[PDB]
Each structure stands twice: as structure tokens, then as C-alpha cells.
Design a protein around this ligand. Sequence first.
Ligand SMILES: Nc1ncnc2c1ncn2[C@@H]1O[C@H](COP(=O)(O)O)[C@@H](OP(=O)(O)O)[C@H]1O
Ligand SMILES: Nc1ncnc2c1ncn2[C@@H]1O[C@H](COP(=O)(O)O)[C@@H](OP(=O)(O)O)[C@H]1O
Ligand SMILES: [Ca+2]
Ligand SMILES: [Ca+2]
Lengths: 281, 281
Amino acid sequence: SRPPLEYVKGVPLIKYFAEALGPLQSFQARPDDLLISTYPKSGTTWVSQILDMIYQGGAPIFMRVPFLEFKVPGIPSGMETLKNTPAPRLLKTHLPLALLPQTLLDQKVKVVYVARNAKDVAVSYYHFYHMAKVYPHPGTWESFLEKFMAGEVSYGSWYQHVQEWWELSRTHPVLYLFYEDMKENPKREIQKILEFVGRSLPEETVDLMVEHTSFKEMKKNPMTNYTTVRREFMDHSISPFMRKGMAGDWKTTFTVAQNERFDADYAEKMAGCSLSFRSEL
Amino acid sequence: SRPPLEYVKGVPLIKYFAEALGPLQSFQARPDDLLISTYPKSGTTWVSQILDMIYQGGAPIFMRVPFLEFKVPGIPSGMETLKNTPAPRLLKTHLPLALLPQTLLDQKVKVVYVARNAKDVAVSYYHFYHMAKVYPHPGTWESFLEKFMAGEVSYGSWYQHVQEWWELSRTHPVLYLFYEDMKENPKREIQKILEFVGRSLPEETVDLMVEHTSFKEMKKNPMTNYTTVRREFMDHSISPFMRKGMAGDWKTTFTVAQNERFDADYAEKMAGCSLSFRSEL
Ligand SMILES: Nc1ncnc2c1ncn2[C@@H]1O[C@H](COP(=O)(O)O)[C@@H](OP(=O)(O)O)[C@H]1O
Ligand SMILES: Nc1ncnc2c1ncn2[C@@H]1O[C@H](COP(=O)(O)O)[C@@H](OP(=O)(O)O)[C@H]1O
Ligand SMILES: [Ca+2]
Ligand SMILES: [Ca+2]
């Protein structure tokens, strides 16, 4: 019923996910866990499918890759789904570093992080707010854009999220990937994931993973497109989860006025950062 | 009902497996197939389980690894089971090179062959003849030993089998392994299989494969011990498939007289061969 967001340590989150944090400090990480970390709508489902295939030598995605802080009225908790989970475990989270279960850092769990350009994230997040009913109603795109720029959306600021994890990468095992690089050359990025997780697969098998993990395929696959969930939960008729999967599509939504204001605000928040994003390709 | 063996191109075989050869020249091999080749009771099930785990990133074994020439009164044909089989395929065969579907050689299919010392093979084969009722009754061990030395058992001569494939290894991709080496150092042999099939797995995961593919484990696992099959097919009460899994246990069955005769006969059949087997460890 589109419940307002709950702030936690300065971070606004889905009411339910906020409640799920208590049961969350009990969580104990294993040395062989693989943590998939991302700001919302940055390629989480995409890299999850890739990692899952890899872990199977080549049920829906949300069952195979437990969502750490997950929790919803008529659905099993993220930590629940993780109980019936044998090692090695693939985990998923969008949690900022201030809310991340300390155990993951203490065990040096390998992290595959994916960052996506902020403009495409914003548009993708606006449409998701519409279809996923656990989120407060977004309002107009104009108002949502403002909330997104002020980090007044679920999981907080995108600017801080991509920067903190980028910095964490200096003293913690982290493979920091870019949604755009994955778009441009999927095989290249999958090979980087294989090497990073200490695995190898014949060229032929990787080429097959590239075909099956393409937007087109993943949009048909009911195990990856989230269509098996209930309508009053996610209304694919409003906006499909597998919306467009493009890089640079934000140009058909941002007005010139909004783009000018966003860029100015951006340069100001990404000043001292060495992170470089490309909004096209 | 213990039907006599059928000779084919000079090779005696299970009546049913003989019949299964016709439907067999229709078989078409793919470039990515992986062929597990062995003379009977040489570690086929063992290396099959290992390869299957590898192919899954770490149903019973006979369903997951189709048995090429398989065929039995109340059970689906080997090529049948292979129809519902997606690439990449793991295949199993005990066929001598004269009966091997040419397509496997023409496609350069990777072969993992396992050889075991003849004395342990003989004893293991004698007990298998007893429990598996598709084989003619073995008779006494004394008589079986003689039949085994004369290649008058299913799949013919062991001497020729281990030599021809050893030679094939010079002009065809073949990883020739020894049952004994696998006993002595399983991790070492599994790493050789990984490299050979162009795969890689973290050390920790391989150590886990070594534990689960040990004789003890595989003897409990109903998916690998063949206990789900029907009794009038295989009578585990007569002799369990997972008998002992030892190297050098042939000393408790061979009499000194039989051993002296076997050695003399052996030196004569393995003369010009560079193959070296160790009957202990
Ligand atoms: N295989 C794939 N290739 C490209 N984009 C994909 C993809 N699977 C999902 N996506 C896109 O990733 C976004 C969702 O990411 P997440 O899984 O983190 O929530 C959506 O972006 P759009 O809204 O821009 O289409 C979605 O269409
Ligand atoms: N994991 C394992 N480790 C050691 N030996 C194994 C094994 N799995 C099966 N075996 C042994 O391999 C032989 C059967 O081989 P195959 O699978 O080729 O028919 C039997 O030998 P014994 O009769 O000597 O015990 C069996 O016990
Ligand atoms: Ca989701
Ligand atoms: Ca068998």
C-alpha cells in the first residue's frame, strides 16, 4: 500500500526492508560468499544471472540469489531464503556501507559491484517506483528527479553509494564494474568476473552465456523477468521490470532544463572523485 | 536371465548392448562432447561423478551421464537418455576402438580415459558379473580368471583395451588417467581433469569435491551407488557395486598359482607397450 520510507542511520528505505535490519545483525557471512552490491537499477539482476550461471558451470533469480535485506508482507524473508542456502553463497544487496552487516567486511567476502550512469539510473528507478508497490508513489517525473538528486529515495544518495564502494575497493576485494561496459562488450566483462571469482570456462561456453544473458533473452525468461510475482506486488502492466535495458535512453525523458540543472548539481557532488561514467553506449 | 554374450567384430558383449549398436551408427557427436572411456570396473563411475560435479560448478549418475551403448529390457536406451541431453554432453563408454562410433573421432571429442591394474579389474569384474544379471553367470573365480585372461568376457581383452586407447592418445585429445593415481592423490588428478576440460575452480571447491567423491561418500550416495535400480537387474545383496574401492586388494583373491600364471601371461601381452601399472596404492 505504498508505505512511506523509513530512515535508518540517515538512510531512507522500504518500510519492510527497514524492519528486516534487526533480524539482520544475526547474519553471519562465510569466507566463500560472493556479494553482489549495487545501487538500485544498476544491473543487479543482470550480473546476478551471470554469476549464477558461472556457479552452475554455465527457480527464479530471487530464490537462487537471496536478497539480503529483503522482506515483504506475503513473501519469505531474505535471510529466510538464505537458510536453505548451501555454500558457496551468492548474495545480493543495495545497502550503503553504513548499514552493511559488518561480518561481510570482517570475512573479506568478494564483492562484485556494478555502477551505472546516474541519469539512466534515475529514469529506471522512476519507472520501478511505479510498478513495485512497496515504494511510495513517485509522483511526477519532475518531482521524482528532484527527490533522486537529493537522495530522498530508497537506499539514499546514488552519488555517495558509487563513491564509497569505489573507495572501499582500495582495501577490500572488490570487482567494480560498469553497466555500460557490460552493454558494450558483455564477453569482456564476464571474463573479468570469471577471473575474479577464480573460475574458468571454455570460450564456447562463455559465448553461450553472453547470448542467454542478453536483455532480449532475460526479458523472455520468466525466471529472470520477475513476472511470476503477484500483481499487487509488482505490476508489470504499469512498467515491466525488463523495461528497455539501454544505455543513453535518459535523453528521451530528461528535458533540457532538467539536464542542465542535473549536470550542474552533478559536477558539484562528484568533484573530488576519480569515477568516470559515460551516459552513452 | 543371464543371456550368453554376443560377439561383434570379434568383441563379445552383453546381448542387449550388441543389439544397441545398430541404433548406434545414427549417433552424431558434437564438438563439445566429453567422452569418458574405460575398460569395465576401472573407475568409470568415479571419474563420471567428478566430471559431472565439475560441469555443475562443483538424478542418478546413469541419467546424468548417458551410457552410449546402454540397453536393457525394462530400461530406456543409452541413446534415448541422450536425446533429452543439452550441450555440453558428458558421455560414457567401454567400447573398444573398433566399435566406437566414428563420429566421436571425426569431431575430435575430448576423451578422459581411466586405466586400472588388470588384477584389481579382474576381481572387481568377477563380483560385478555376479550381481549384474545381464551378464552370463561367471562360474568359479578360477574359471572366470581364465576367461578374463583370454578376453572371453564382456568388452573383450583388457590388454588390448588399455593399449589401443593409450596409442590413440598420440593423435587424439585424450587425458589418460590411472585409477591408482586417483586413489593416491585425488586432488592432483582432479586438477588435471579441470585443466584438460578448460575449466577452473577455487582450491576450496576442489577440496570439497575430493571429500564428496571419496569411496566412502560415493558408497552412501544413492545417486552414485546404483542402489535405485531393480533387484533382478543388479542384486546389491550378492555384491554391492561400491564393493571396496581399493588398490591392491587382488592379493586376497589371487592364489599364488594363479598369480604366477597371470604374470607370465601378462609379460607376454604387454611386451612392446610402454604402459606402466602399479598393483598397490
Ligand atoms: N540482461 C540485461 N541486459 C541489459 N539490461 C538489463 C538486463 N537485465 C536487466 N536489465 C536492466 O537493468 C535495470 C534493472 O536493474 P536491477 O536488476 O539492478 O534492478 C533495468 O533498466 P531499464 O529500466 O533502464 O530498462 C533493466 O531493463
Ligand atoms: N569414489 C570411488 N573411489 C574409489 N573406488 C571407487 C569409487 N567409486 C567406485 N569405485 C570402485 O570402482 C569399481 C567400479 O568401477 P566402474 O565405475 O568402472 O564400474 C569398483 O571397484 P571394486 O570392485 O574393486 O570395489 C568400485 O568400488
Ligand atoms: Ca528486485
Ligand atoms: Ca554401470
